[PDB]
């Protein structure tokens, strides 16, 4: 089996696995690291971002004064934001056959692969995954749109200028394959190419393989995959959460007893205590509200938002802050709430029982009923009619480089009393908040993570004991933040081979057996026979019939094994009718003479030889005799 890893990102993978006669690729990363590097897109053009000064080449040859701009001693690129792609040219994705999805964050990059490249096979994902993915791509395409900034620069994308530029523009990787954003017809094309699957569903591919998804528990419908043939097992685990969360809990029973385990989607901040930082969030939120300002929280419309609103529901009941309202602003807000509402069977047992006792599983429907939390699609209109101060706003995009988030903190940047709270760990908040610096806004960084830490990784691997482990180089290596700490690296016996962006591995396995079926009449015909205690064997003579890579045998040249004894030979010749047979002995063999047809036979250790005259019927009699005095293989 062979593995091609097309993403150096630890969280956003593309893994092309070649097994037997099929090709199965997993996940789709759309790295917004280049998005972090590009300039933000104001919904309404702010004067300061309009007149940001232009950083200049020290040589002065290139037109980087208008290709690039500078702010607070730091430099950014001025265009529409780009997105980093996985390297598609390592393997022809047309020859790549079947695509699996873990979760919506891992399906963000799907129209790129599914429209332009020429892939034409089938794609699998669960229902909540595919629906929340459609909502996310709708939000993303809207925000790259809704104001077209068609400017694009390329002389900075020249390699020499990239070398001359300072970090992190010096630290930019694979600038050449960065692309502009995709559109609704592309979205609909991929989302019609999709097919559906539930948990523990066995999907057969060509008889060659069978795939099953299991609840990882990180997100609503987030799923680890299991690919098996009848002797071979690959467990692909990406982004599980074994803590008590809202989705279905993680299921390791089918995960164990695996030949090859690939592990991705681990935590980004290992030292983060989730519930503790959630409590710190609530305390800081109460402090800002009591001070009388406005709080911003950028968040994806799944997962962490639901957990945050539940805890804020309990905390607002605790602190008695029913005066200050909550506004959830995103063009996907209404459909996100409704989809989280009806997706019930994918939840955990507490929420399923909540469904079974006629109430909605999430409390934010009751929050809407009590009118504390109001959802709004865009900031223009009735939201502008109903805005309040002091206030709470959960805004659409967490990467901060486009949307209602950037407009709101352009509005609120001058004030100090207001507060921004980061809640998603997928980006460095320093490089996120660099363009607005200097900033009077209070910034409190309390990231929320549910991906399993290395202690739980060690526990899970010691529970399941796979034969081979595959993990990223960033998980093998110590982090630059705390290289002194030892528990921050994955430990496994045997040590897992690593991989880098666009790398090829050949996994340590050799294909030996596969699954074939016998047919009952042929099994009736076959009679086993025993040469060794506990070993009974039978020679076979059949016709193979193989349709759709599944194999069966039906009735329509074996050789010998075993030495023949001379004493039993002559005894059975005498009792069969042969007479006047004389035996002489040698150093290792016996020479036996039969006077009829003048037959001389020498018997040695793994050596027998019969010499006679031109005779036929005696020869074939001796043929059947010597062949029936041995075991057939």
């Amino acid at each position: 089996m062979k593995l091609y890893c097309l993403s150096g990102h630890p969280t956003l993978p593309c893994n092309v696995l070649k097994f037997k006669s099929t090709t199965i690729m997993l996940d789709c990363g759309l790295d917004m690291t280049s998005t972090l590097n590009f300039l933000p897109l104001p919904l309404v053009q702010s004067p300061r971002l309009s007149n940001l000064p232009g950083w200049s080449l020290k040589d002065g040859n290139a037109f980087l004064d208008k290709e690039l701009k500078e702010c607070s001693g730091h430099v950014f690129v001025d265009s529409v934001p780009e997105f980093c792609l996985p390297e598609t040219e390592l393997i022809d994705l047309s020859t790549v056959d079947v695509i699996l999805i873990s979760n919506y964050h891992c399906m963000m990059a799907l129209p790129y692969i599914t429209e332009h490249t020429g892939f034409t096979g089938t794609v699998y994902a669960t229902e909540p995954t595919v629906q929340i993915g459609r909502l996310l791509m709708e939000e993303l395409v809207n925000f790259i749109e809704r104001v077209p900034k068609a400017q694009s620069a390329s002389l900075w994308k020249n390699k020499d200028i990239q070398r001359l530029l300072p970090s992190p523009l010096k630290d930019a990787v694979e600038v050449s394959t960065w692309r502009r954003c995709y559109t609704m017809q592309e979205v609909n094309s991929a989302l019609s190419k999709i097919q559906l699957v539930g948990y523990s569903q066995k999907i057969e591919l060509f008889g060659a393989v069978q795939v099953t998804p299991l609840s990882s528990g990180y997100a609503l419908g987030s799923s680890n995959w299991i690919i098996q043939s009848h002797y071979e097992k690959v467990s692909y685990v990406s982004g599980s959460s074994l803590l008590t969360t809202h989705p279905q809990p993680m299921d390791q029973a089918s995960l164990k007893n695996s030949d090859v385990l690939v592990l991705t989607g681990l935590t980004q901040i290992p030292t983060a205590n989730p519930d503790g930082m959630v409590g710190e969030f609530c305390s800081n939120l109460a402090l800002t509200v009591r001070n009388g300002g406005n709080v911003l929280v950028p968040c994806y419309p799944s997962g962490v938002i639901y957990d945050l609103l539940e805890c804020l529901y309990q905390y607002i009941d605790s602190a008695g802050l029913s005066s200050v309202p909550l506004y959830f602003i995103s063009p996907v807000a209404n459909s996100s709430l409704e989809f989280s509402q009806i997706f019930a069977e994918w939840l955990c047992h507490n929420k399923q029982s909540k469904v079974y006792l006629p109430e909605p599983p999430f409390p934010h429907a009751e929050l809407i009923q009590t009118n504390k939390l109001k959802h709004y699609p865009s900031i223009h209109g009735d939201f502008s009619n109903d805005f309040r101060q002091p206030c709470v706003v959960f805004t659409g995009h967490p990467s901060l480089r486009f949307g209602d988030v950037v407009h709101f903190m352009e509005l609120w940047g001058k004030s100090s009393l207001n507060t921004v709270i980061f809640t998603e760990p997928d980006f460095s908040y320093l490089e996120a908040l660099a363009p607005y610096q200097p900033l009077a806004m209070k910034c409190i960084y309390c990231p929320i993570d549910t991906r399993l830490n290395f202690i739980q990784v060690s526990k899970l691997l010691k529970e399941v004991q796979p034969l081979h482990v595959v993990c990223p180089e960033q998980y093998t290596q110590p982090p630059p933040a705390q290289s002194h700490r030892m528990d921050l690296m994955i430990d496994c016996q045997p040590p897992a081979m690593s991989y880098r962006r666009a790398e090829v591995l050949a996994l340590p396995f050799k294909r030996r057996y596969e699954k074939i079926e016998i047919m009952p009449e042929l099994a009736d015909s076959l009679v086993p026979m025993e040469i060794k205690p506990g070993i009974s064997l039978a020679t076979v003579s059949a016709v193979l019939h193989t349709k759709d890579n599944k194999h069966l045998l039906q009735p329509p040249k074996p050789l010998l094994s075993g030495s023949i004894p001379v004493e039993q030979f002559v005894q059975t010749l005498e009792k069969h009718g042969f007479s006047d047979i004389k035996v002489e002995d040698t150093a290792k063999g016996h020479i036996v003479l039969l006077q009829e047809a003048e037959t001389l036979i020498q018997i040695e250790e793994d050596s027998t030889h019969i010499i006679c005259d031109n005779d036929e019927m005696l020869r074939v009699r001796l043929r059947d005799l010597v062949l029936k005095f041995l075991q057939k293989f």
Binding site: L43, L90, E145, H380, F383, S384, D548
Partner: protein, 828 residues
């Protein structure tokens, strides 16, 4: 060069996966070779291929195919690829890469015989793999390199071989062979039946396309097309909906069939129960699954119903009951197919529910489609006409907006069949047999709706002017006066290129009368300017060319006034102030030349080089004025250098048309150019001054019927004193709806400009989905403009205008609109 350096770098590095993948990715992603060095790069790649890492070898083969996609190489690369395929039997990845390279070489450029495709086909046939290695790829190789119009044995075996993927690839090759022709046979029909029975997905989906194509090839088995059609229907009842959509579209593409077999498909009913009261293919395929197979079914039905003159009634009922299909796409497609089949068609009972259909909530598309259906339909009975009228009047009095479509469909009804309405004429309009009936209302829409039907009926039959009353006489006069395209001409007793030549004559008058006094030139120019402006108002198709020549004459008059300014009479060192009508003239003349270049639609390079001549003349006049006002000899030197540089740019760009310019400013200056290189700028501008004073006037060749662009904002109206209210810092979205007329490159040229009353301009670009194109050269811009600012004390007026940018500068060509904006402060 670069390829040799890359090969040397790869050989020097020689890392196993790392440098190989990095070099391959860099060479692929950087650029195409775009030269003949692709062969040398391929030779270096073939030399480096004799190594390990078959994955890197496959990547190199893909890079070779990508390089061959530029069609630089042919036979040498073909021979090298043949050698590599013969000597490189190393597993599935390298086999697939070789197959892909072979396909790229075959389909890249040659497309010829004589070992350009036949040798590759023989090589693929000999190198067919053992287990999924090349089989699919070599099948599509032979598909795209089909030999001649003389492979059938091997494709027959590859139909019955192991893998469904290989089967589907063979079937795709069959698509390719049929679209190249190749005249398939009936053994393909038999094996296509046994491929229809294949127990597996998508193999069926493409194999049934093959059974369709052989059936439409020829109908000779025993009945071949009827057997194929029955197989198609028994395949339509499969569960797989993609298969069903494919099935329905392909059976609709089928056009000839046994008629009795078609009614056997429609055979099973409350339709015939209702018919007596008045007096399984499609019947599962319509209400089997949702709107995909439903739309495919109705398109199939419309195509074969347009084919068959019979058969329509047994789908007439199956459409009239399947209006209310709870999917509006299915609704609209049902109405459209009823229109397209509505010929030799009676609706003796179905009028009631098909008009309960046009009674409908909002559904503006549905109601319009039903009006089209009623205008293009036929009816048989006078009672049906009567009830069609009464519920049509129900519709008009219930939704008084689509009365225009109501009147036009009543018109088409009267024109379609006039004789049905004749007994209703006393009844539909009250004409009490001896009384003086009171005069009906004139502009009452119901009465208009009945009158237009009456007149369209009376087009042919003459036996009802006597039936008319006197109010009907004067109302026919008024309706014929008003709605010219709705009522026709009748026989009632009461109602029984000079412009182009003139434009040419005036222009040649100016051109001939060029050689006279500057004053008389001024009055002649003014007179002809207002003349051509009057003509541009007067006509429409000459308006663009008239305004274009008019603004050119305005240009010339402006320059002549700038020359005749008294600044030249007054001595040089003074240049007092405010007499710089010359400078204002220079700015206006430059702006008019830009406008004259870009805002107009049809311009050709003769006009363009005339424009650039005039722009050079403008820059010369501006240079003269700045020379008059400027004391610095080095600023004079700089301006002179830049001006002569631009003259050099002009002549370099327009090498041509120098014979076309006779006695021209620019060509005489090009003759005197080296002396300008020698001489000091003072005498340069002196000679330039006199030179342009008695330079010339060029002719402007008038082109064909060109137009000038015109932008009109129809929304927002801007007369509203009700302000648009919001809270401070928040944004309000304001829709902009404008009509653009005669604009090229609209999504890149038309940009919105908003002036905020604190004085700042915000330039908003529209996304290219906002430019709808309903017709030829006439576009609609529908967009959002996002307005925000801090709070204001009162309402103010924000300006919205449409700017046109070129490539460099912007030109307004729209009337500005004022929108009242008022932001409130925060509520708490």
């Amino acid at each position: 060069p670069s390829k040799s350096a890359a090969l040397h770098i790869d050989l020097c590095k020689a890392t196993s996966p790392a440098d190989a993948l990095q070099y391959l990715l860099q060479f692929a992603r950087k650029p195409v070779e775009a030269e003949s060095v692709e062969g040398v790069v391929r030779i270096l790649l073939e030399h480096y291929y004799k190594e390990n890492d078959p994955s890197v070898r496959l990547k190199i083969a893909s890079l070779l195919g990508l390089l061959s996609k530029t069609a630089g190489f042919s036979p040498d690369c073909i021979m090298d690829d043949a050698i590599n395929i013969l000597q490189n039997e190393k597993s599935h990845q390298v086999l697939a890469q070789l197959l892909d390279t072979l396909l790229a070489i075959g389909t890249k450029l040659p497309e010829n015989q004589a070992i350009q495709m036949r040798l590759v086909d023989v090589a693929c046939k000999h190198l067919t793999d053992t287990s999924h290695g090349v089989r699919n790829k070599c099948l599509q190789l032979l598909g795209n390199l089909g030999s001649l119009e003389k492979v059938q044995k091997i494709i027959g075996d590859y139909f019955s071989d192991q893998d469904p993927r290989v089967r589907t690839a063979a079937i795709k090759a069959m698509l390719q062979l049929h679209e190249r022709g190749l005249k398939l046979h009936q053994t393909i029909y038999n094996q296509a039946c046994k491929l229809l029975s294949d127990d597996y997905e998508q193999v069926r989906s493409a194999a049934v396309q093959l059974i369709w194509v052989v059936s439409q090839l020829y109908p000779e088995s025993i009945r071949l097309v009827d057997d194929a059609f029955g197989k198609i229907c028994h395949m339509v009842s499969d569960g797989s909906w993609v298969v069903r959509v494919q099935a329905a579209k392909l059976l609709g593409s089928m056009e000839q069939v046994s008629s009795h077999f078609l009614e056997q498909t429609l055979d099973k009913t409350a339709h015939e129960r209702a018919k007596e009261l008045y007096s399984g293919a499609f019947v599962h395929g319509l209400e089997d699954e949702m709107y995909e197979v439903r739309i495919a079914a109705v398109e199939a039905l419309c195509m074969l119903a347009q084919s068959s003159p019979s058969f329509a009634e047994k789908c007439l009922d199956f459409l009239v009951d399947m209006f209310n299909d709870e999917i509006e796409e299915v609704r609209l497609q049902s109405i459209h197919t009823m229109r397209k089949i509505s010929n030799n068609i009676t609706l003796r009972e179905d009028q009631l529910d098909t008009v309960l259909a046009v009674l409908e909530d909002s559904s503006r598309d549905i109601r319009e489609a039903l009006h089209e259906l009623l205008c293009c339909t036929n009816v048989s009975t006078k009672e049906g006409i009567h009830l069609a009228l009464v519920e049509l009047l129900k519709n008009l009095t219930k939704y008084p907006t689509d009365r225009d479509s109501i009147w036009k469909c009543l018109k088409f009804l009267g024109s379609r069949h006039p004789t049905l309405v004749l007994p209703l004429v006393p009844e539909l309009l009250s004409t009490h047999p001896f009384f003086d009936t009171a005069e009906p209302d004139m502009d009452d829409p119901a009465y208009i709706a009945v009158l237009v039907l009456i007149f369209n009926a009376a087009k042919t039959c003459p036996t009802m002017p006597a039936l008319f009353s006197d109010h009907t006489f004067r109302h026919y006069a008024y309706l014929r006066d008003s709605l010219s395209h709705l009522v026709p001409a009748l026989r009632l007793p009461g109602r029984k290129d000079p412009s182009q030549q003139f434009l040419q004559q005036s222009l040649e008058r100016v051109y001939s009368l060029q050689h006279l006094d500057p004053q008389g030139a001024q009055e002649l120019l003014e007179f002809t300017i207002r003349d051509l402006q009057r003509l541009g108002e007067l006509q429409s198709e000459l308006a663009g060319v008239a305004d274009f020549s008019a603004t050119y004459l305005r240009c010339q008059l402006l320059l002549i006034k700038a020359l005749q300014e008294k600044l030249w009479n007054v001595a040089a060192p003074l240049y007092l102030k405010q007499s710089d009508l010359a400078s204002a003239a220079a700015k206006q003349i430059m702006e008019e030349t830009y406008k004259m270049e870009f805002m107009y639609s049809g311009v050709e390079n003769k006009q363009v080089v005339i424009i650039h001549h005039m722009r050079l003349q403008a820059k010369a006049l501006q240079l003269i004025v700045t020379a008059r006002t400027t004391r610095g000899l080095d600023p004079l030197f700089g301006m002179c250098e830049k001006f002569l540089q631009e003259v050099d740019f002009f002549q370099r760009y327009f090498i041509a048309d120098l014979p076309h310019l006779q006695d021209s400013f620019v060509d005489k200056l090009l003759d005197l150019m080296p002396r300008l290189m020698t001489s000091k700028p003072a005498e340069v501008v002196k000679i330039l001054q006199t030179m342009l004073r008695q330079s010339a006037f060029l002719h402007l060749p008038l082109p064909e019927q060109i137009h000038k662009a015109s932008a009109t904002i129809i929304e927002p109206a801007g007369e509203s004193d009700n302000p648009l209210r919001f809270t401070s810092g928040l944004v309000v979205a304001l829709d902009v709806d404008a009509t653009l007329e005669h604009v090229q490159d609209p999504q890149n040229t038309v940009k919105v400009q908003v002036l905020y009353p604190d004085g700042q301009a915000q330039m908003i670009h529209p996304k290219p989905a906002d430019f709808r194109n309903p017709g030829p050269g006439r576009h609609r811009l529908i967009t959002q403009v996002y307005l925000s600012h801090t709070a204001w004390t009162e309402a103010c007026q924000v300006e919205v205008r449409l700017l046109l940018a070129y490539n460099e500068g912007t030109i307004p060509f729209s009337k500005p609109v004022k929108v009242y904006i008022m932001p409130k402060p925060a509520r708490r």
